[PDB]
Amino acid sequence: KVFGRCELAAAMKRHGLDNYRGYSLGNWVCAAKFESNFNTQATNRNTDGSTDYGILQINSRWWCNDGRTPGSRNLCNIPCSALLSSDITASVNCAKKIVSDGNGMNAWVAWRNRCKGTDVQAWIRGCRL
Ligand SMILES: [Cl-]
Ligand code: NA
């Protein structure tokens, strides 16, 4: 599914990401644009060979098992495939654990490289609040 911007803003708020660990809702919406262009089915290979999955692009080396990544820890106890669904819950439960892993949202290179230091409110500007 390719969420609409406000559709995705609305869903992430439902699961309690607005201001989670101090990161405003727009930082999450901003992360989800640039990680995946808003698409729950998104999958991209990383050079270590790991793969990034879904809306936020949760990585198989730590976070999820895909069966082809040596040394995977499956720190969300989950199949990476389940994070491609239309029901963003597993991705949120996992993202809450990543962000809580100390480096915060800097765990997402597109957040660091593109969201951080910006007015992340443009990402929810027009959302019915
Ligand atoms: Cl932080
Ligand atoms: Na893993």
Side-chain angles (χ1 to χ4, degrees):
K1 173 179 172 71
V2 181
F3 272 69
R5 181 174 58 84
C6 293
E7 187 187 17
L8 185 64
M12 282 176 148
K13 184 167 194 191
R14 198 260 285 192
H15 283 101
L17 288 179
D18 47 305
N19 321 305
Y20 187 78
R21 310 305 188 216
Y23 287 97
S24 69
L25 183 68
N27 289 103
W28 294 103
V29 178
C30 186
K33 167 61 180 177
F34 295 117
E35 290 292 343
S36 68
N37 195 31
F38 292 143
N39 189 346
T40 68
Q41 293 196 71
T43 66
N44 295 104
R45 196 77 98 142
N46 297 118
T47 66
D48 75 350
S50 73
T51 311
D52 296 328
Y53 295 87
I55 199 64
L56 286 171
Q57 289 291 277
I58 293 169
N59 177 266
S60 66
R61 170 64 169 75
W62 292 97
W63 298 104
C64 69
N65 176 59
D66 77 1
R68 74 173 189 192
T69 307
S72 62
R73 285 301 336 265
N74 193 13
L75 294 176
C76 293
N77 193 26
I78 191 166
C80 293
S81 70
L83 304 177
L84 305 167
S85 173
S86 67
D87 171 5
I88 66 169
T89 298
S91 294
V92 174
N93 300 337
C94 187
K96 287 182 176 177
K97 185 172 190 333
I98 300 181
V99 78
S100 299
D101 190 62
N103 275 342
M105 289 193 72
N106 297 289
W108 282 273
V109 60
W111 182 81
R112 198 170 41 85
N113 287 335
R114 299 171 84 171
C115 302
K116 186 181 187 179
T118 78
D119 180 11
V120 297
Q121 201 267 308
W123 291 96
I124 65 176
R125 77 194 146 82
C127 302
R128 186 75 155 268
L129 184 56

